[PDB]
Amino acid sequence: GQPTDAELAEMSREELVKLGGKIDGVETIFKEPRWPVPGTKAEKRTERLVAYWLMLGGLSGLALLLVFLFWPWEYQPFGSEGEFLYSLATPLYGLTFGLSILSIGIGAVLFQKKFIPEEISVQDRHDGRSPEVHRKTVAANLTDALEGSTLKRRKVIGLSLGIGLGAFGAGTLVAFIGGLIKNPWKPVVPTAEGKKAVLWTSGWTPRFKGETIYLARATGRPGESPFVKMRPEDIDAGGMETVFPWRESDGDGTTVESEHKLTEIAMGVRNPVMLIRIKPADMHRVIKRKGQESFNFGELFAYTKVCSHLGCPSSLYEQQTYRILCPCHQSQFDALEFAKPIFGPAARALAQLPITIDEDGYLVANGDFVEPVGPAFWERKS
Amino acid sequence: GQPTDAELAEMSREELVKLGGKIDGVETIFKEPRWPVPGTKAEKRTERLVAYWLMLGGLSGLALLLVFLFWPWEYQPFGSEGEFLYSLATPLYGLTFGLSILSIGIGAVLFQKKFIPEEISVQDRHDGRSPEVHRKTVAANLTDALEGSTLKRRKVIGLSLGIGLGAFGAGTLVAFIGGLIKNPWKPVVPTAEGKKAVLWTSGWTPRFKGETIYLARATGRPGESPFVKMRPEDIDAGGMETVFPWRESDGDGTTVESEHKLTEIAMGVRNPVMLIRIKPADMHRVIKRKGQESFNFGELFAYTKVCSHLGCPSSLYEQQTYRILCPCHQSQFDALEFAKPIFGPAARALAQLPITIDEDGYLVANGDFVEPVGPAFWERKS
Amino acid sequence: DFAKLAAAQGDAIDSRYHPSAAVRRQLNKVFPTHWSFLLGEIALYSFIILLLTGVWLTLFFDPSMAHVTYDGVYQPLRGVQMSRAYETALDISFEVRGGLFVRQVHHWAALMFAASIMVHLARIFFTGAFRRPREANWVIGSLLLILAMFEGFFGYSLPDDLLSGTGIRAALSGITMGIPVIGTWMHWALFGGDFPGEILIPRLYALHILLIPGIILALIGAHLALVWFQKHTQFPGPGRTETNVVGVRVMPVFAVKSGAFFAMITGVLGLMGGLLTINPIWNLGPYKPSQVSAGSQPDFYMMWTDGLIRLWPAWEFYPFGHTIPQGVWVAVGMGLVFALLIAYPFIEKKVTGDDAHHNLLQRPRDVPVRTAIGSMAIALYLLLTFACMNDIIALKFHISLNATTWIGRIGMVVLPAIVYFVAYRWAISLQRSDREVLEHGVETGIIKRLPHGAYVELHQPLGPVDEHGHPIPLEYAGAPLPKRMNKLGSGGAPGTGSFLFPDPAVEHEALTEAAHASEHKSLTALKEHQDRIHG
Amino acid sequence: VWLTLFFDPSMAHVTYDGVYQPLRGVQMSRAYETALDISFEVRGGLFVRQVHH
Amino acid sequence: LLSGTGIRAALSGITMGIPVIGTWMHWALFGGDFPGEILIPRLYALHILLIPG
């Protein structure tokens, strides 16, 4: 029960370790060397094994250095000799690096499990309710800080400080957030009937009265003429085509002014539409919506690709069953009937785009979606 | 001397504060209330003053909220009515926010200088050389961990661990960095004399033999035809114009293929040159550079704008003194004599571009710079 | 003279500083040596790897939606418009040496981060590690899991990609804009406009490299601080009580094994990053709103959300001029999940009424109701996760997609109930197995009794034996029992020579005697510590 | 952190086409365009980046 | 313009000037010559995440 002012001089390493454990409440019970019998060749085997794992880690690290420094990396076009070497460049990087560090870890674990002495140290856990002296001292300190500061007696400062902090925090959080807050219903998109909010319009919204919005096919040419006029005979019975609202003004993508109108059409989240040529024999199975009984040009039905549920494209098309499937959440809409969901999460039918053909026989939108075309939101169906 | 097991119940708040200070070695000397005399109206007025500062902070925070919500912010074009309101929108935001928080802080400082009791607490500083018991116990713990671990006795394991860690670290650092390392002297820029490293070339390097690189002026038109061929008559005695290496293929920016070549010309660090028309009366004063005696076309001299010191543009030009001045570090080159630095940090002359006039009388480079044109580097002047 | 140099450096440190007491206290801290307690470490280790990889990727990634043509090395995507973010992801994959490896190991480390967090949560929950001290550590831990899931989402959402782009379109856009009061407002604040808004990817980059990683780092620091200073809980055992920690001290053993485990885990991660391909974005064309694939799945840690949406029966509501899209449901469901996860320990202590300070873990079998609840929750999570794969499951395992959807729909109510019943009865049966081991003892080979034909299992008692053959029954003490004579001192003296050749009989005898005596000394020390603790 | 919610680091050349008239149709890096947007397009953005600097 | 010319002077010129590895450091920092298209994103990473950390 004394701090060992001078006894520490003669204390051995074990004695001082025990003294430290006693100070911390940590009792080391059964600390024993892993190799009590000296000279045994099992110890030598174990030491060589640990060193072997470490050496394997080191050789693998050297191999990582060499392969990273000297290996035919770099993408090799398909079919080019040396592509095989590239295909296993990253695999060798990972193989060598992981093998090196894994072998180092294995050697460390083996050293821990076979050389570092085994201990069953037990510690004094003092969890919960610090001794009453400390609790009373802490409470007294905090209460003295509070009451002595004379607060809860200066009701005027008590209220004014709170009002100041409340007003300042309100203003500061308002200043933080107001930069982000944007009105979803600010009329920004021009329309034939005046500027409208973005969600009320897509690329098919007529920017001008009698605007010719062609159902242009998206030929994936690299940059030039990405959108091309389309004609009814192009799609044959039981065929689907993704079409976009291309204008005469939005000419091919050669010009710098163009190539961005076209890019805007491509990036138009609600722009894409799927035009499906219903098989003639199946036209007697078609069912039409209120106000959409003439949206189909003969056997051509244009339905938005944007799924009505969370707004993924509904690209998948099944003919001989006429099912528009959305791959995000596996929702089937019935194409014969107005594109109403016959299975899956979706509960609203796809918006049908009116269509017809203008002079020269090109397919052109006969109007705009009579309802908003994306996934539903709070301000919808009114 | 004793933990006060049951006395803590009878100890007062001040007694417990003293006990806590004693435990921590903190002696609170001269802790007294700031207002010992009760009922004095000086106390009331200081209370009012602190409350006034806090309420001013609160009113300022409310003003910040109100101005941020409702104020004519948003850029107003110069001259438009309401531009004045915008010009002090951000000033009002900052003014209100700063007054709010500053006044709250002022009120807090005044509260702690007027009401929080004044203390001259003194603490026991136990810094340096923790007691001998702790030092020897730590030493024993660490030495037992080391020696007991049996290291410094398995030379093979220690050496293998060192080798493995070193090899793995080398490989991993090489893997990290090799992504960054790029050979600056990889021949990437095509040239009439074969692919060359970037620093050996600029927009004036002839991509093919006999290539006509026009000294095109950079008219700041919004996108279209930013570069137009140039004629000697355009520059008048004592006149400087920045010119760029415009090729025939790098046509106007009308198309998408162009407007990217032109962007490359504009963003070429070493591409810009300055063409200066030396006054005829000053012509006799011109001193030429060996190997650059015919680079001037009559009284027209093309010198790189890029400073020979750290590669800033040397845009400033002084006629009647013929001083090409670089403003990054105020370096003066003599334009009359070959553009050699006559003041400032620069020590190498600006590279002179050969020039002449082609068919139709347009100014075209008569060849590439005889030397690299940017700021100097290690592999230069050989 | 490394010894002299070390002594001098220690003296200098302890003269400028005075940490000897603190250094000793942290060097002597005892941590239990149970394997399950390393589970959480995995996550931490993986987290570190992510940081180390993440930094590397921040030097090469350009977040943006600036439309650009690739004009790079990868021929199959050349002249195709795409975001600068996708271009730089492709350049990392192809144009930067090891960049493909680095980003693959980054994604694998994200997956391991998620999986190890999930397994660690399973451990804490089934063992009751959250029950009184450490209830906050559960809350701060549950908030780490949510942040990790969202961080991974923003991560693979970061390189603008067809798969990740359609994932953003579904979740962040549709669900956000479905929320009734402020759905559109939240959507426009997040995207700065409509879905493909030109500010999305830079904002996600800010959220994913700095903001969410920073919050996760702070929460992990708090978590480890609490574990360190709320001494780690332990399983019931011989010398283990509510008021101690039995294990190994930090420095000599725990620190070395923890470092070796970090090395081994990073080796596993590197091996996966090399040999296994994760997220081949070059195959995933640049995001185009009109393009999509059949798979269209998020990383596993988020698939459950998608699965929920797939299995929710397309229920919407249409108030006066408004509509609550079915997507809203998943958000609400998500809330509930987190709402029921962060606030579990409090529900447990409300129902059970068990607010006592528990430092000893309890085996999952010892708490059949909580084990059943956790099994039911895991079953629901697995059902949702595999429902998110119902497309691929139907494709590979030929099952009609509608059949898979309806299997998930019926299951998300039936399978949890079956799993709860099975897990409850299983926990009770495990308890009965332990009780019968205590009553009778371990089992062994069979013997035919001498006079008659009786066959007896030839048990082996674990405690004092009564005057006759049968032993006094032992009382369950909350610790695992030996159900195999395997794991006692039975048939455990193989040749110590080598795998190929023997060692001299003297050396084998000495080694085996030393190990045998060492095991006695360990068991005896535990027994005396037990007796001193209790009595 | 606030600035990180509105800044797009890149040299992708773009025409401003924003509110600030004296820079319209002028090629600028996306980073400069977003700095201009913070200054002019986002409420308090000029104030926030100003107090940041 | 101001910050760009500051980058040009300091980073580009001085790094290129360093004798042994100066050009190599310049090409690593910019991923190429001065107007390298990976400078500003790298500075963003260094400035919002690495150096503040």
Ligand SMILES: CC(C)=CCC/C(C)=C/CC/C(C)=C/CC/C(C)=C/CC/C(C)=C/CC/C(C)=C/CC/C(C)=C/CC/C(C)=C/CC/C(C)=C/CC1=C(C)C(=O)c2ccccc2C1=O
């Ligand atoms: C929403 C929902 C739950 C829908 C139900 C559909 C569903 C999950 C059906 C189960 C799938 C199975 C097991 C099909 C086999 C036929 C069948 C149903 C037999 C009866 C089932 C039964 C109880 C049999 C008794 C014995 C028994 C348990 C047999 C199970 C046989 C199996 C498949 C065991 C392994 C479990 C397993 C790995 C299932 C697939 C799970 C997933 C998501 C794999 C993902 C995965 C895929 C899909 C790859 O294509 C791939 C390609 C290359 C590398 C890696 C992978 C990869 O990891």
Ligand SMILES: CC(C)=CCC/C(C)=C\CC/C(C)=C/CC/C(C)=C/CC/C(C)=C/CC/C(C)=C/CC/C(C)=C/CC/C(C)=C/CC/C(C)=C\CC1=C(C)C(=O)c2ccccc2C1=O
């Ligand atoms: C192409 C390319 C770029 C490739 C590179 C891949 C890439 C981008 C990144 C990964 C590359 C790298 C750098 C991999 C290696 C990472 C690394 C440093 C590994 C070190 C492991 C190693 C080699 C060990 C050798 C064996 C040995 C002698 C071990 C003992 C000495 C060591 C290393 C001790 C380390 C201890 C350690 C891991 C401390 C972590 C520090 C932290 C954050 C927490 C500590 C901590 C832990 C670990 C707890 O478990 C815990 C549990 C309960 C309460 C509190 C705590 C607590 O505070």
Ligand SMILES: CCCCCCCCCCCCCCCC(=O)O[C@H](COC(=O)CCCCCCC[C@@H](C)CCCCCCCCC)COP(=O)(O)O[C@H]1[C@H](O)[C@H](O)[C@H](O)[C@@H](O)[C@@H]1O
């Ligand atoms: C107690 C707080 C009291 C304040 C209530 C806040 C809301 C009241 C709004 C009512 C006035 C509306 C007319 C004037 C306003 C108006 O017309 O703007 C609207 C958007 O309202 C704004 O101004 C910004 C709103 C300010 C942020 C509010 C944050 C919510 C509050 C409730 C949370 C903090 C308060 C403390 C409580 C929490 C305590 C924490 C425990 C629409 O935006 P828009 O038409 O596109 O213009 C865009 C510009 O606003 C936009 O700043 C700019 O970024 C551009 O993007 C621009 O497009």
Ligand SMILES: CCCCCCCCCCCCCCCC(=O)O[C@H](COC(=O)CCCCCCC[C@@H](C)CCCCCCCCC)COP(=O)(O)O[C@H]1[C@H](O)[C@H](O)[C@H](O)[C@@H](O)[C@@H]1O
């Ligand atoms: C102790 C380490 C021992 C190894 C020494 C490392 C230096 C030896 C280089 C020998 C290889 C030269 C011939 C084959 C290779 C070759 O020609 O590549 C050259 C560039 O060498 C490379 O491979 C990448 C270099 C590797 C990083 C080395 C970093 C320096 C070391 C010394 C520092 C860490 C080591 C640990 C010491 C510190 C310990 C800390 C205590 C040129 O680039 P380039 O032709 O453009 O190709 C580019 C592709 O490299 C590039 O990865 C890719 O990103 C593209 O840039 C591509 O353009």
Ligand code: HEM
């Ligand atoms: C904290 C937990 C984190 C998780 C779960 C996580 C997860 C992910 C994942 C799954 C990816 C996908 C990468 C790909 O598929 O190529 C990713 C991307 C990325 N991460 Fe993180 N990450 C974390 C932390 C960090 C940190 C701390 C940083 C930076 C220090 C970072 C930087 C990046 C970058 C730059 C990318 C995009 C690079 C690319 O995809 O090519 N991440 N993250």
Ligand code: HEM
């Ligand atoms: C830690 C010390 C820091 C210093 C000395 C510092 C300094 C600066 C300065 C002077 C600017 C110029 C702003 C302007 O002229 O408009 C700037 C820009 C910026 N800073 Fe930092 N900053 C620090 C920390 C941070 C942190 C922690 C972040 C992110 C959390 C950050 C994010 C940004 C961003 C995004 C910009 C560019 C936005 C803009 O210019 O409008 N900075 N920084």
Ligand SMILES: CCc1nc2ccc(Cl)cn2c1C(=O)NCc1ccc(N2CCC(c3ccc(OC(F)(F)F)cc3)CC2)cc1
């Ligand atoms: C959608 C399913 C899906 N299909 C595919 C297809 C392909 C691919 Cl690749 C991926 N997927 C996924 C997908 O990955 N889904 C992950 C996901 C789900 C929801 C959220 N949500 C968080 C809460 C937000 C929210 C709501 C309420 C709030 O209110 C509060 F908390 F009070 F403030 C705050 C935020 C909405 C978005 C995120 C990711």
Ligand SMILES: CCc1nc2ccc(Cl)cn2c1C(=O)NCc1ccc(N2CCC(c3ccc(OC(F)(F)F)cc3)CC2)cc1
């Ligand atoms: C140049 C002056 C200037 N003129 C103008 C004009 C206009 C404007 Cl707006 C601004 N300016 C500035 C300017 O702002 N200057 C700041 C500055 C300068 C140098 C560096 N240096 C980092 C280290 C590099 C280095 C050095 C040693 C190395 O070796 C090592 F360390 F061992 F790896 C590696 C790299 C050199 C550049 C940074 C900022």
Ligand code: FES
């Ligand atoms: S995203 Fe189309 S069904 Fe859900």
Ligand code: FES
């Ligand atoms: S930058 Fe031109 S004198 Fe230094």
